[PDB]
Chains A and B, each alone.
Chain A
Amino acid sequence: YXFF
């Protein structure tokens, strides 16, 4: 975590 996190991502696009």
Chain B
Amino acid sequence: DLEDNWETLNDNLKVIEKADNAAQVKDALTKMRAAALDAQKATPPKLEDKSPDSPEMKDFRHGFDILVGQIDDALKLANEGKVKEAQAAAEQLKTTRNAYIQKYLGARSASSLALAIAITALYSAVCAVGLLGNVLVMFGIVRYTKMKTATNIYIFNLALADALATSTLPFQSAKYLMETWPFGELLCKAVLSIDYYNMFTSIFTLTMMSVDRYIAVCHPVKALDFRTPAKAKLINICIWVLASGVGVPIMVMAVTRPRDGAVVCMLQFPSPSWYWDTVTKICVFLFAFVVPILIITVCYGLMLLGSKEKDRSLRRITRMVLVVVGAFVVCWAPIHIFVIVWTLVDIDRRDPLVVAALHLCIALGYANSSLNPVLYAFLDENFKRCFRQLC
């Protein structure tokens, strides 16, 4: 609410500095005076919850009574037609603002801190699970010769992308808490492109697992030729190369720049950025979400259409993939919707309940990576055994 008011002071100030007449100068002043009075009413973060009559609080409030006074002065001039004089008077109050009140602003809200700590918690929590949980999955598959299944080789691929994903989390946590990116450009590039690799390689593998189940079920004759592990490895590598059609351009495009007191990691789309940004944001929604989903739904639709333990086994393994597919969807469906709203429907983007909910369901996205290894070891018996065998 206050930074909003401080925003309109600054903005109206430079409207006066670019003005050509008394009316439009006057109007601007009259806005600032309102801004400065609703700002005076407000308590700022540096003064989190001091005595409503502490020296520092009395002193902050004073700064505004001063500023207002000066606005009523400039407004007396503009009223009398004295434009330039009103403009000069406006110049001196930018300073009088900064000299007195500015020392009270800039700090982070206690709520905001709480969010940051809450995130760091969840992140650390996800991170400790997923990073562990998928290193196990990756270790378990390679080590034990008994585990080289076509579908399991695809899982390896997921456990890899998920692992890589969950290695970036503490860096994001530190970025949130300390309000800056202290890790340098290379690692900025590393972290973002990893975040994109994670989305595509996952959803492409999950499409190919689905394609895999389908040929398994509906074309068991044909399957024997295409359902080998060596080939799954090949498709895994294809999934990665293909994904690099989106991952490498981000690798280059991602960069580190200083902005308004901090260092921030971000994407740099060739101008127009806001357009190309949307372009990509749509493609990621189509080609890493709906379009692969439609394929999966088809694959699964068709399977609605042999020995004792093998028929039971297919069912169990097939039913596993649907859950991980579904579990995936429900984790990412929230955030993929939110981002498309965020970048098309102009809602209110600074609200507590909004920002939190966004962050609190980006978190769900990343929670998908810690969930996976659990689902593997609770819906696959061989995984269930291995995980409680170790310890």
Query: Which residues of A does B touch, CB under 8 Å?
Result: 1-4
Contact = CB atoms under 8 A, between A and B. Distances in A.
Nearest to B281: A2
A4 B281 CA distance: 11
Interface string B175-197: 00000000000000000100110
Give chain B's interface secondary structure class.
helix
B365 A1 contact: yes
B267 A3 contact: yes
Nearest to B268: A4
B335 interface: yes
Interface residues of B, number: 15
Interface of B: 192, 195-196, 198-199, 264-267, 281, 284, 335, 339, 362, 365
10 closest residue pairs by CB, A with B? A4-B266, A2-B339, A1-B195, A1-B199, A1-B365, A3-B266, A1-B335, A3-B192, A4-B267, A4-B264
Contacts, number: 20
A2 B365 CA distance: 10
B368 to A, nearest CB: 11
B176 to A, nearest CB: 12
B227 to A, nearest CB: 32
Nearest to B335: A1
Contacts of A3: 192, 195, 265-267
Contacts of A4: 264, 266-267
